[PDB]
């Protein structure tokens, strides 16, 4: 509930590491925007949402729970941000546009979450 098993700091500590990561993705705006905001299945027009990903998630909820402090363990934010590029991954059938957008997000992030997952977990 509170402290998983590893270190687990203040939701702000994490953010210190986490957010910067998200922020690298935030630079990848054309790749992050599709998530910086909720993955509107209406704006998208994909009723198949929640019927594939099961865990929608989006840099909106992400950059939020992070910022707001709805965390305690960094791997949680990771499992979410990754769960995000994931929706773009197993949802867009891979051969799509987000495919490129999520690819990077997970890339930079996997490159951002290193200084994080290391100083966070």
């Amino acid at each position: 509930g509170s402290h998983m098993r590893k270190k687990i700091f203040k939701p702000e500590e994490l953010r210190q590491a986490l957010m910067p990561t998200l922020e690298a993705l935030y630079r990848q705006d054309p790749e992050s925007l599709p998530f910086r905001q909720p993955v509107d299945p209406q704006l998208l027009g994909i009723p198949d949402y929640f019927d594939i990903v099961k865990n929608p998630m989006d840099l909106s909820t992400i950059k939020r729970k992070l910022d707001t402090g709805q965390y305690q363990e960094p791997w949680q934010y990771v499992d979410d941000v990754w769960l995000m590029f994931n929706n773009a991954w197993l949802y867009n059938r891979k051969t799509s546009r987000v495919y490129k957008f999520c690819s990077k997000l997970a890339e930079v992030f996997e490159q951002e979450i290193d200084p994080v997952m290391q100083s966070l977990g």
């Binding site: 599709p34 993955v39 998208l44 027009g45 994909i46 867009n92 799509s96 546009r97 987000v98 957008f101």
Partner: peptide, 15 residues
């Protein structure tokens, strides 16, 4: 092509 429409940034459009 592409543009912002329909799905995410999808919007194939061919016909």
């Amino acid at each position: 092509g592409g543009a912002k429409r329909h799905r995410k940034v999808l919007r194939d459009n061919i016909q």
